Design a protein around this ligand. Structure first.
Ligand SMILES: O=C1CCc2ccccc2N1
Ligand SMILES: O=C1CCc2ccccc2N1
Ligand SMILES: [Mg+2]
Lengths: 153, 152
């Protein structure tokens, strides 16, 4: 592997480890990975971090009833750009009706960007991904990893 | 004021807001501010963040029973360099016997650096500072802010 490839895999591993912990504890989480469409306008609504990715920091951000847990983490250029960011709520009538604003925010940003958003449900610990206006629900660890690898390829 | 001075004031405001929040809730915390003696050896023992300072991130770091809460946060200027860092434990006999490892780690790093370390006690909520081998306990909000402003 090359340095860039090793860094991308390290980030994927850090994300999957954090998602796994939050799924087990049913910690709600919203993590958007910026791609070609710039999301500076949304990054600026949150608390600036520009931090190195780690599973530890991702977990610490989303602990319930803490300053940073409300809103989205947005990643950009292999860093955590900001936390507690606003994302637009989808008005799509085709999202499962049992899901709340976290999933609607993920779908909403995916309607106006090429980003990939990961959601952990606080009700079930289920893991889903929003891209292109669609929500892919009930993902296994292997399925999330495949989506992250496809996105970065 | 220069941009450097304004940035320093924002970082002091972030630190004091976080310390005040944690003291009221008995959230133990250990926060070392690097000065002219470089702390790279200790930064490298923790989880790298290299993050912009905010009161929110400082609070989130120290929440009990989380990955980042055990060990020291080390700050470099206006960044949180790393969390969950090792610091050496002082053997000074002038550390109150009831105090635990966070206070002994703070005095310990203060004996081999010119850093300023802030400690929040999870037992009492008391705020203390270690500097040059001495621990100063039970600081008021005003006293802590004045110490930080004097440190910059
Ligand atoms: O209030 C709280 C604090 C801690 C926590 C951890 C994991 C899931 C839910 C909670 N709720
Ligand atoms: O992406 C992921 C992360 C790990 C995980 C654990 C348990 C159920 C589903 C998942 N999916
Ligand atoms: Mg006194």
């Amino acid at each position: 592997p090359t340095p860039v490839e090793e860094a991308q895999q390290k980030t994927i591993e850090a994300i999957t480890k954090a998602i796994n912990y939050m799924a087990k504890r049913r910690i709600g989480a919203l993590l958007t990975i910026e791609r070609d469409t710039g999301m500076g306008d949304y990054i600026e609504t949150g608390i600036p971090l520009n931090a190195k990715v780690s599973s530890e920091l991702l977990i610490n951000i989303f602990i319930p009833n803490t300053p940073l847990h409300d809103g989205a983490v947005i990643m950009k250029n292999n860093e955590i750009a900001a936390a507690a960011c606003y994302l637009p709520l989808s008005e799509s009538p085709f999202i499962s009706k049992e899901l709340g604003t976290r999933h609607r925010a993920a779908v909403g940003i995916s309607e106006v960007t090429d980003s990939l958003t990961i959601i952990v449900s606080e009700e079930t610990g289920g893991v889903s991904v929003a891209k292109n206006g669609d929500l892919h629900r009930e993902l296994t660890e292997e399925a999330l990893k495949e989506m992250l690898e496809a996105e970065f390829k």
